[PDB]
Amino acid sequence: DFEEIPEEY
Amino acid sequence: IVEGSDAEIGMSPWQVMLFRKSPQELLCGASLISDRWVLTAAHCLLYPPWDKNFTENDLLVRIGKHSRTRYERNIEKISMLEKIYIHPRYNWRENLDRDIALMKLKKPVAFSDYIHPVCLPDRETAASLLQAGYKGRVTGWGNLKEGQPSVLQVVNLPIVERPVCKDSTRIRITDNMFCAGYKPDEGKRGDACEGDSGGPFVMKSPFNNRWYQMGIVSWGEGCDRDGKYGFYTHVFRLKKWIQKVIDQFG
Amino acid sequence: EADCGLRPLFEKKSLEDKTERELLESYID
Ligand SMILES: Nc1nc2ccc(NC(=O)[C@@H]3CCCN3C(=O)[C@@H](CC3CCCCC3)NS(=O)(=O)Cc3ccccc3)cc2s1
Ligand code: NA
Ligand code: NA
């Protein structure tokens, strides 16, 4: 449902 | 938020989304009170009845957001948690008395057009604005009915007389709570709902034109039911605890 | 912060949002 967020976090 | 409307861009720059790492999902609302501190409801982090007990590494703080599900590149900022602080007398066993918690960020967040802290009330601001009839504003990405919204929702609601709040429920109401919402005879409606918990109830002071967070979305029996009201943590009443934590650990 | 509660896109630019007036009108006392 949520767009992935950059792996860095 | 039930029966509210889409927020304007930058309308609630202190709005914070508590995000669970895995599964990636919305956990609760929250608010930015400084470059390193976020305020939310204790039940968003600790609620034994539902086996909820998150630790710092279980979640993330997304600030400056508008869209609920999208990663707002170049706009929202994602922060990790250094430490969680729950009110020592938070009553999860009975009525969510003292439903408040603080979260310190690992690094300071940079303010921008979309990220800005809300003020906390002093005794006079609270005395002056926390009156039956006076309207506050509640925001969140919670449910629209008792699916999910595309963008942040907002609704303005009037503070309700304490006797009326008490007579609307069988739950024991304390001075650390206040309720808000329209009566059945007032026609208009609106309320916080699942997912809005931890979010801010704010009011704009007519004295200095600044926004103050007077409450925290705490609980309600159902969402936007006639005869029912939304209950909020009374922020000023617990400010001494807030100041203590920040003075000691900030 | 001495700048808390003043929104960059609203108070800072002297622009009002679509419903804040509703709040002000309710502060009758
Ligand atoms: N105005 C609002 N309404 C709601 C309804 C769901 C969520 N509720 C929540 O996040 C919190 C989490 C713990 C369970 N919960 C709650 O607010 C409790 C009600 C609490 C229980 C403990 C003592 C105080 C009352 N659950 S809630 O309303 O779903 C329970 C319910 C009661 C009557 C009919 C249908 C459902 C937020 C809001 S904010
Ligand atoms: Na919220
Ligand atoms: Na003035």
Of the candidates B32, B24, B11, B10, the one whose C-alpha atom is nearest the C-alpha of residue B199 is: B32
Side-chain-side CA neighbours of residue B21 (13 Å): 13
Q: Quote the number of domains for chain C.
A: 1
Cβ contacts (< 8 Å) between A4 and chain B: which residues? 24, 71
Q: From the CB of B199, is ligand 1 less than 6 Å away?
A: no
The residue whose two tokens read 């005869």 is B227
Say whether the A–C interface has 3 or more Cβ pairs within 8 Å: no
Q: Boundaries of CATH 2.40.10.10 in chain B? A: 1-12+118-236, 13-117+237-248
The contacts of residue B160 (CB under 8 Å, 6+ apart) are: B132, B178, B179, B180, B181, B183, B229
User: Which chains would you list as touching C if contact means 3+ CB atom pairs under 8 Å?
Assistant: B
Alpha-carbon span A1 to A5, nearest angstrom: 12
Q: What residue numbers bound the domain in which C19 lies?
A: 1-29
Report whether B117 contacts C4 (CB < 8 A): yes
- What are the tokens at B218? 């705490």
Overall resolution, Å: 1.9
**Are the C-beta atoms of residues B61 and B19 closer than 8 Å to each other?**
yes
**What CATH number does the domain containing C22 carry?**
4.10.140.10
Q: What's chain B look like in SS3? A: CECCEECCCCCCCCEEEEEECCCCEEEEEEEECCCCEEEECHHHCEEHHHCEECCHHHEEEEECCCECCCCCCCCCEEEEEEEEEECCCCECCCCCECCCEEEEECCCCCCCCCCCCCECCCHHHHHHHCCCCCEEEEEECCCCCCCCCCECEEEEEEECCHHHHHCCCCCCCCCCEEEECCCHHHCCCCECCCCCCCCEEEEECCCCCCEEEEEEEEECCCCCCCCCCEEEEECHHHHHHHHHHHHHHC
In eight-state DSSP terms, residue C12 is G
Question: What superfamily in CATH does domain B1-12+118-236 come from?
Answer: Trypsin-like serine proteases (2.40.10.10)
For residue B21, give the amino acid letter: K
Greatest alpha-carbon span in chain B: 48
Give just the sign of the alpha carbon dihedral B134, B138, B144, B150. Answer: positive
Class of domain B13-117+237-248: mainly beta
